[PDB]
Amino acid sequence: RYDSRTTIFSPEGRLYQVEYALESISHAGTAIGIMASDGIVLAAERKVTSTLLEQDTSTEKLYKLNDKIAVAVAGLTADAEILINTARIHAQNYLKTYNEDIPVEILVRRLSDIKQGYTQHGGLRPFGVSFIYAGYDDRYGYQLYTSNPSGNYTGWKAISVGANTSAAQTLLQMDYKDDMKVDDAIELALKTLSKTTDSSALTYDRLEFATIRKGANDGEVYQKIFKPQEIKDILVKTGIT
Amino acid sequence: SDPSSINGGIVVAMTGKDCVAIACDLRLGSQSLGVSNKFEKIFHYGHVFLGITGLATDVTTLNEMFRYKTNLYKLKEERAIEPETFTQLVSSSLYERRFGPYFVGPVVAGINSKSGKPFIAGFDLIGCIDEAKDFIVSGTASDQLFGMCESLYEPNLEPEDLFETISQALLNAADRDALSGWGAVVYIIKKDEVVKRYLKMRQD
Amino acid sequence: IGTGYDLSNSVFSPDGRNFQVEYAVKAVENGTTSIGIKCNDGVVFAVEKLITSKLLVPQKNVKIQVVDRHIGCVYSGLIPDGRHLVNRGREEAASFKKLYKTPIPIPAFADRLGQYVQAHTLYNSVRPFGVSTIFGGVDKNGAHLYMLEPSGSYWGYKGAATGKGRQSAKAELEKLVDHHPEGLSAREAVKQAAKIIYLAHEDNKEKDFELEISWCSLSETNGLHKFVKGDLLQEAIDFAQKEIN
Amino acid sequence: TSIMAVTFKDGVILGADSRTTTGAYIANRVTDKLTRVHDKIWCCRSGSAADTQAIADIVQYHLELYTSQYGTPSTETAASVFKELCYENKDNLTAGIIVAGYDDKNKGEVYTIPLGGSVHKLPYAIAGSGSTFIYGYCDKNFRENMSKEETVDFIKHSLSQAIKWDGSSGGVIRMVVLTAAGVERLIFYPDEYEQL
Amino acid sequence: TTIVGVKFNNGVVIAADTRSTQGPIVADKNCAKLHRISPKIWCAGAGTAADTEAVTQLIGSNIELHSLYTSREPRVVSALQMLKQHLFKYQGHIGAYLIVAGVDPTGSHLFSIHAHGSTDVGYYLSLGSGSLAAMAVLESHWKQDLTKEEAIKLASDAIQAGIWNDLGSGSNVDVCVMEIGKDAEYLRNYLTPNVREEKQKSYKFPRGTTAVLKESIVNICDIQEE
Amino acid sequence: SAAGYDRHITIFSPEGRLYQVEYAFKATNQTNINSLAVRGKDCTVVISQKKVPDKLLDPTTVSYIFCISRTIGMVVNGPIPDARNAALRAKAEAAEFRYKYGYDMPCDVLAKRMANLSQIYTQRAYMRPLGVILTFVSVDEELGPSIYKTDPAGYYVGYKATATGPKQQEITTNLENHFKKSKIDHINEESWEKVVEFAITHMIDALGTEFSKNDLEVGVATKDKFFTLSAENIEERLVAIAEQ
Amino acid sequence: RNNYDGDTVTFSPTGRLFQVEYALEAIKQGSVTVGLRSNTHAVLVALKRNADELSSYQKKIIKCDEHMGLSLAGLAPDARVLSNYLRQQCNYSSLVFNRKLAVERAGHLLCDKAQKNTQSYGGRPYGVGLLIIGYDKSGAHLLEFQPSGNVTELYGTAIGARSQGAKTYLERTLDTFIKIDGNPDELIKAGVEAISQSLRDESLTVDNLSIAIVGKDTPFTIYDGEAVAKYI
Amino acid sequence: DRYSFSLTTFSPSGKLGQIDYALTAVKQGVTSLGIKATNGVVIATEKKSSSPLAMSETLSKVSLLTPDIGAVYSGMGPDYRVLVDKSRKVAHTSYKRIYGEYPPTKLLVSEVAKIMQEATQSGGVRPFGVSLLIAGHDEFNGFSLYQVDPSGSYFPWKATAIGKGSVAAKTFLEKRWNDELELEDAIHIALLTLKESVEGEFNGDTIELAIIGDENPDLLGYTGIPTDKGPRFRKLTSQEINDRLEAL
Amino acid sequence: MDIILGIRVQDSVILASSKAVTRGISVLKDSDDKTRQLSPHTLMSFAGEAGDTVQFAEYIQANIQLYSIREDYELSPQAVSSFVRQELAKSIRSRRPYQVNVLIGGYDKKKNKPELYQIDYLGTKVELPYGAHGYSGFYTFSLLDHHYRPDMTTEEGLDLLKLCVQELEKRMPMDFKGVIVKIVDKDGIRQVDDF
């Protein structure tokens, strides 16, 4: 077996370690970011729940790293915390240094180098996490990417990770309207989230949501993590509640 | 004396009654040469306003410095930084360097949202708590302003009353200082509304 | 055995011992007999350095080595490994002299050497020691005799013994408690040391030996350690041969 | 300010003046300059209060650890320990220490460490900027192996003279008698001492 | 600034004026000048204002950990002994000049500290600019064995006398009494010798008596998107 | 079980625990020594056995009661190597603490910092746990008489009285009867000498074996001091019991 | 078991290590040298090896100093690290103390250096024997350095392949060469006889001989070709 | 097997064996629980004496990290003590110079988490043996409760429990929890839940129960300041627990 | 000695820099390059302290080129000007200084406006469309702004600059050996001859 250090290679010319990190995603919650010209939505699903769980005054799989860029989480949560904090630190370096907000491509690119660095160097784990990046820069507008646990990035207009990626992806690309709208993103996301999730009635206390818009309150970007009762409004439109 | 004295420039903040004003001059000079007639010394991280006096480099550099720390504070805790808590921070951060201490005299002002009480605080090179509910003045014309502001201050004032007091104060004191003046701008934080009123004054 | 327990020095057995430390004690046993005899006014150290061929040069290879000018130490087991514990020991000795402007007390030395052995069992990347070390001298409190184990255990002794012929030595030392409850005086103990090593050399018999004796005595070596050599050593040799016969 | 310790037949008696001075103003007129570093061994502090206070503290924890591991310290031992601090910091720090102790095997001892330091054995040592004046006095009127009472009276008169010719010497004359009768502090009022 | 610390046979009381003087300009009329090391250890600053403030928080945190470790009321020897080694290292390049006062279950204690630091164990002390003014009052109005009410009349007199003679002091006298095993009652504005003189004229004007080039409106409240 | 588990202290078992640490709790049976610590009202007493089994060993070099610092004694039970290692660190830290903090290091605080020390050795695989049990005795100035026992795990807890050894249980049961019936957690007499008589008696019944002066070593902690008794002082207390 | 055939930090049940034992093997596959000495001289005679007859043969004599020198038998890589070290110490003694390093004193430094690698888990342990000669204040001395670090002062000794016949030459003639002093010629001839017997299924040739000599009258000099075809 | 002889690789069903064993180590502990109300927070634990002669009164298993925030644990005893030590130090550094008074509850949890996380990261390090509960009170997010897992993740909760009796405590809390509880009411739930776990020894000598409610200027050690806020943390004595334990 | 000039016109930024370099009492050459292109549409003229101008110019040029090349699209004059200023602000707090004053005149393509910034030797970034440093700004703060018409073109600004230069030679005892004028526009950067 190859398991001892990450300084080795399996006969596929990859490492078994990378495969193990891959699988870590597909036992966590489901995550979907759909981009439109009029705003990008980020959505995540909770992988624990109780009625004595506080989840109505908090989120856990949704962090803003600067006031123009936000991330969703799928993977273990223990892995997540360390790398979020570093992305956010890198953003404020950018702000300090250049007097402006970071591009989406770099911020992701850095983070991807760092994951690969723990594969590359030492007997230290790969970090089995997939993050959905939804950002703005005034060079390529809205930008949706995701970052691999192997540590590479690929651009997008919609993507799903998490649990049942394949099932989710076919469903997203079917219903993708070509101009798209932020209101349709929001609508599509709930529908797609439902079928993967093992509950038949998706609910707002079981939902995390942020929508990013510059298409209303123009000339500036305002990113809003939704409050629980608003999430309830959008659920009522999709006819789930 | 110090480098803070060579470059100069004034930031004065004051309290009335459920309001603050923090105002500044538009002069940046580097010694004898006047450099900009329009460099604003007022900056802000949420509702907390940070003025900066002193050497020209540290006006730009410390601004970047305190921006960095208020942005990590804001995101993690999901609330605005408070003027009560920012006073703690300014004093420790400047104290980090003591063997290369930053040569500035800041003024912090804001209004706390967890009580609505008005807060102004004064600092020096490496900063100390200096608590006021009256006024904190700073710069090369600070000795003029300390008396000018006391003289015109009448305790307990309206948001509209406080404009008058800080304007007459700045107007003569900046003018009758070498290294200060050359325009002024006044920010009246009424509670959470900020109106910006440019002072027509002469070019010094 | 297996299941750890000797495979590293960190890991511990359910018995209350460590079987890797037991094989180190076996290495002290294999080494050549050394004895030390405490006295009411000195210490005598002796060693058996066996002669394997006559190609060796006589009185030139020994296990007696001095520390300062008044602490004698002698080692059994793995020969270069006992040398090294003395070489570090010598470094430790010097530090103490420089800082406090005083000669080292023997129980002070005793603490400091056993901290070196113990450090070599806290790490799986450091092989323990496998040497016992008989030691002592004359100081502020008079004469003291110690011995240190490769476990990293040590205690004070009236008579001490280690090596291959240690089975004889132990017996002669006991005869001595009874014979003299002062543990014998330092002058007559140089001769007592020689006789002991001769009965011990009956357990090594197939070969010849070379006997080196050293001493440190309060007023018969003047607070200082010096090597027993000359007409002194030959008298010690004559006593031994006579009483063995 | 002036400090001394004089050996006697059953001990060692430390003598010192209590005024501590920064410039011509007296900081405090009751500073204890005789400071414990160990059970049977105490040091005298002169010079700068600040430098001598720090160097005693460092040695205090060290001689505690010496007593636990390495058996009972000596005055001799103590004095060298102060030397190492004094020699390396001969330019950073200025530390006047008279290092006086009592053994049941070496009786009272008085060792004096200059600024630079060096361990020197003396039948009495005297140190400070108040020591200059009283030298000749103590040189003639040293009787050796004199009684406990004879020591205390001798020291009392010598230091009286130091107070007359220095205003940074004065206050109360404090004494630590390290003997086999315990630790006895003594204090002497200006009413007692000056007529003498 | 006059600082006085006065031990007594039930506790300690430390007092100081509230007025901050940095050079020839009065920096603040009132300010708390009693700095907290620990909740029964209160202390007052002299020399540099920024350095005495800055040091008392770092140290005081280490005494607070130690206060939980020992599970006991906090000790003044521990506070003083940490300042005493700490101030030494930078060799006066960071100074801090303090009357440390506190109480402990081993009794009441009183200290002074320097820039480099040395111990001075007094019964009554004064430090600062108003050391020379305060001293003559502490010495001569002193009775062998003080109690609570006595200790504070002697202490207050000494501040009020140094308000007259010194000009580094003035305004209201802020006081802190720390009595052994009993709460520290903070008496700010204990003795107020500060008289006040009012302006004979108004200084408020109707608008348009200042001139306005232009106006502008900036936010400090975030935007929505809905 | 065994598949990694026992071979490390950085590899957890299926129970979540470490077999390897737990095997040192079985290292007090190998030296075959028992302690007894009891508190009087103003004192703390510690008595541990002294084993001299050979006439080539002086009674005064074999001791297990160590002076750590002026007011602090400690008894060691278990192996001679880990005995020394613990002793050093406790002396270096006690001396260092005392002048840094200006306080005499209480029984709770020495027991605390050492237990912390023992936890640090277990988290890295480079280091190993101590094997010995250290039972610290001091009369504190903040709590009077105290016994805190620190375990080879880095557990530490207070005790009315505590015992350690292979026959530890038999003494425990004897102390249980004593404090329970009287309804006090101390030995009632106030003189430290007469407390030491009571403690010696409980042990001789409990083990079943009469002891001698060179089969005990006794340390006695009084108000701000510690001292260890010599054999002739110990004999005086033994015969105190023997003849009423 | 032989779970100890990998660990050099873990004792073998005998009390040895296998690594130290294998290191003696390395010496056996190594190239023969014979030492011997007298009071006023010491000589090293060593066999040069070749892999073919277009090889110009391996130096088996390294000049450590102008009065001290060594020869090897075993691992040449390990021989290099210790030769470096050894010259550094002899030059140190001539720099600071204007002193020749005693043969015996040098050897005790090399001892700590062997056992450091035994204690550690890092880098190779040694596997070469060095025969050391010098001439100091205490006349010529001959040490046999072992890769364990054991240093043994003899009147003659040998290490390398098939070295048990050199010990038999030396034992018989032990006294012949104690009596000869002041004749470098005699001492050189005695090693040459010695290493003929040592070898088996070989013969000596001119350019297989490298003889290195130091004494009280003879400077440190290496003889080759026509300076060693006088003693073959 | 190899997914907890090494920490690099993972199970193909997710997570290291080390984490699942670290949870086993939690349950081998005493039972600890917390209940949040809207005017208070109760925190409660049991203490095994584990000798008739052991004094668990001298060391309590409810320990203030800072004056407004106490914590408990369930899991290994040695592992708790160093971890608590680091809580007190980081707290002063991280926010008693930024805000000049002790931290938010919320903040100290994100700090603690990074430490637990770092011991899950690499080989030659083991997870901590505990899961903690950190309860506290600040004015910026109000009353809060949290569970801090040795995986390196943390979760806020309204009421939760951990330890040996966790699985019994959790269903119990679901039933008795309401939308508005009082502090007194939450203490009355807390005693019943823990009593399911241990019975035949339940008394306030052996059960330690304490609250985070309002300020105590009495545990503050000073008064005379119009703005002072004393320890939100408060210990009930043995006698006070008995008054509540009768009330059932 | 050593002047740098700047004017912002409403379609170009025009930087000028002296061709003269003096070390000792000796003018080393009457042709010296003292302005470097950071990228093909952003130009840094620089002047300042002895041989610091050379080390600092090449250090700054290389970094901007790396970031333009890295992003794969040249950075704004706004990004560029903070970065240069920030190097300087670190240096005066470090144990080695660089005291080099500079002007960044870029054509910003991001929002389509020419941008002249004034960056101090101290390390102070302030935007001014008539900035200038050393002893130049003592004469040209006033000359540019007297004749300054609120809208400007490349044609208008060049005659006014030439005039400025003509004053400097007259009232300083200096020699600049003329000045090279490189014009920064939307078509890149070019050299055009002037007095």
Curated annotation (Swiss-Prot), chain A:
**SMART domains, per the entry:** Proteasome_A_N (SM00948)
Classification via Pfam families: Proteasome, Proteasome_A_N
Q: Does the keyword Phosphoprotein apply?
A: no
**Residue ranges crossing the lipid bilayer per the database entry:** none
Q: Which part of the chain holds the cross-link Glycyl lysine isopeptide (Lys-Gly) (interchain with G-Cter in ubiquitin)?
A: K96, K195, K227
Task: Please list the GO biological process terms of this entry.
Answer: proteasomal ubiquitin-independent protein catabolic process; proteasome core complex assembly; proteasome-mediated ubiquitin-dependent protein catabolic process
Please tell me where this protein is predominantly located: cytoplasm
- Looking at the keywords, is Ubl conjugation present? yes
Subcellular compartments: Cytoplasm; Nucleus
Pull one GO CC term from this UniProt entry.
cytosol
Record keywords, A-Z:
Cytoplasm, Isopeptide bond, Nucleus, Proteasome, Ubl conjugation
- Per its UniProt record, what InterPro entries does this chain match? Ntn_hydrolases_N (IPR029055), Proteasome_alpha (IPR050115), Proteasome_alpha-type (IPR023332), Proteasome_asu_N (IPR000426), Proteasome_bsu_CS (IPR016050), Proteasome_sua/b (IPR001353)
Family (UniProt): Belongs to the peptidase T1A family.
**Function recorded in the entry:** The proteasome degrades poly-ubiquitinated proteins in the cytoplasm and in the nucleus. It is essential for the regulated turnover of proteins and for the removal of misfolded proteins. The proteasome is a multicatalytic proteinase complex that is characterized by its ability to cleave peptides with Arg, Phe, Tyr, Leu, and Glu adjacent to the leaving group at neutral or slightly basic pH. It has an ATP-dependent proteolytic activity.
List other remarks. Present with 17100 molecules/cell in log phase SD medium.
This protein's name = Proteasome subunit alpha type-3
UniProtKB/Swiss-Prot annotation, chain C:
List the record's Gene Ontology CC terms alphabetically. Answer: nucleus; proteasome complex; proteasome core complex, alpha-subunit complex; proteasome storage granule
Keywords, ordered alphabetically? Acetylation, Cytoplasm, Nucleus, Proteasome
> What PROSITE patterns would the database entry show?
PROTEASOME_ALPHA_1, PROTEASOME_ALPHA_2
Database matches in Pfam families: Proteasome, Proteasome_A_N
Q: Where is this chain's protein located in or outside the cell?
A: Cytoplasm; Nucleus
Q: Which GO terms describe its biological process?
A: proteasomal ubiquitin-independent protein catabolic process; proteasome-mediated ubiquitin-dependent protein catabolic process
Q: Which InterPro entries does this chain map to?
A: Ntn_hydrolases_N, Proteasome_alpha, Proteasome_alpha-type, Proteasome_asu_N, Proteasome_sua/b
UniProt xrefs under SUPFAM superfamilies = N-terminal nucleophile aminohydrolases (Ntn hydrolases)
Matching entries from Gene3D superfamilies are given as: Glutamine Phosphoribosylpyrophosphate, subunit 1, domain 1
What PTM annotation applies here?
A: The alpha and beta forms are probably products of the same gene with different post-translational modifications.
Q: What is its main location?
A: cytoplasm
* Single Gene Ontology MF annotation: mRNA binding
Q: What else is known?
A: Present with 12000 molecules/cell in log phase SD medium.
Q: Which family does it belong to?
A: Belongs to the peptidase T1A family.
Role, per record: The proteasome degrades poly-ubiquitinated proteins in the cytoplasm and in the nucleus. It is essential for the regulated turnover of proteins and for the removal of misfolded proteins. The proteasome is a multicatalytic proteinase complex that is characterized by its ability to cleave peptides with Arg, Phe, Tyr, Leu, and Glu adjacent to the leaving group at neutral or slightly basic pH. It has an ATP-dependent proteolytic activity.
Swiss-Prot record, chain E:
Function (record text): The proteasome degrades poly-ubiquitinated proteins in the cytoplasm and in the nucleus. It is essential for the regulated turnover of proteins and for the removal of misfolded proteins. The proteasome is a multicatalytic proteinase complex that is characterized by its ability to cleave peptides with Arg, Phe, Tyr, Leu, and Glu adjacent to the leaving group at neutral or slightly basic pH. It has an ATP-dependent proteolytic activity.
CDD domains attached to this UniProt entry: proteasome_beta_type_7
Provide the E.C. number(s) assigned to this enzyme: 3.4.25.1
Tell me where it mainly resides: cytoplasm
Report a single Gene Ontology molecular function.
threonine-type endopeptidase activity
Q: How does it assemble?
A: The 26S proteasome consists of a 20S proteasome core and two 19S regulatory subunits. The 20S proteasome core is composed of 28 subunits that are arranged in four stacked rings, resulting in a barrel-shaped structure. The two end rings are each formed by seven alpha subunits, and the two central rings are each formed by seven beta subunits. The catalytic chamber with the active sites is on the inside of the barrel.
Q: Tell me which UniProt keywords the record has, alphabetically.
A: Cytoplasm, Hydrolase, Nucleus, Protease, Proteasome, Threonine protease, Zymogen
For this record, an example GO cellular component is:
proteasome complex
Q: Which family does it belong to?
A: Belongs to the peptidase T1B family.
**What lineage is on file?**
Eukaryota, Fungi, Dikarya, Ascomycota, Saccharomycotina
What protein does this entry describe? Proteasome subunit beta type-2
Q: Which organism is it from?
A: Saccharomyces cerevisiae (strain ATCC 204508 / S288c)
* Hydrolase in keyword set: yes
Swiss-Prot record, chain H:
According to the UniProt record, one GO cellular component term is: nucleus
Keyword set includes NADP: no
Which key words are in the record? Cytoplasm, Isopeptide bond, Nucleus, Proteasome, Ubl conjugation
Q: Print the miscellaneous field.
A: Present with 7060 molecules/cell in log phase SD medium.
Q: What is this protein called?
A: Proteasome subunit alpha type-2
Cross-link Glycyl lysine isopeptide (Lys-Gly) (interchain with G-Cter in ubiquitin) position reads: K106
* GO biological process: one example: proteasome-mediated ubiquitin-dependent protein catabolic process
Subcellular location(s) per record: Cytoplasm; Nucleus
An example of a Pfam family matching this protein is: Proteasome
Recorded family membership: Belongs to the peptidase T1A family.
Protein purpose:
The proteasome degrades poly-ubiquitinated proteins in the cytoplasm and in the nucleus. It is essential for the regulated turnover of proteins and for the removal of misfolded proteins. The proteasome is a multicatalytic proteinase complex that is characterized by its ability to cleave peptides with Arg, Phe, Tyr, Leu, and Glu adjacent to the leaving group at neutral or slightly basic pH. It has an ATP-dependent proteolytic activity.
Quaternary structure?
The 26S proteasome consists of a 20S proteasome core and two 19S regulatory subunits. The 20S proteasome core is composed of 28 subunits that are arranged in four stacked rings, resulting in a barrel-shaped structure. The two end rings are each formed by seven alpha subunits, and the two central rings are each formed by seven beta subunits. The catalytic chamber with the active sites is on the inside of the barrel.
Q: Which CDD domains match?
A: proteasome_alpha_type_2
Where do the TM regions start and end?
none
Originating gene:
PRE8
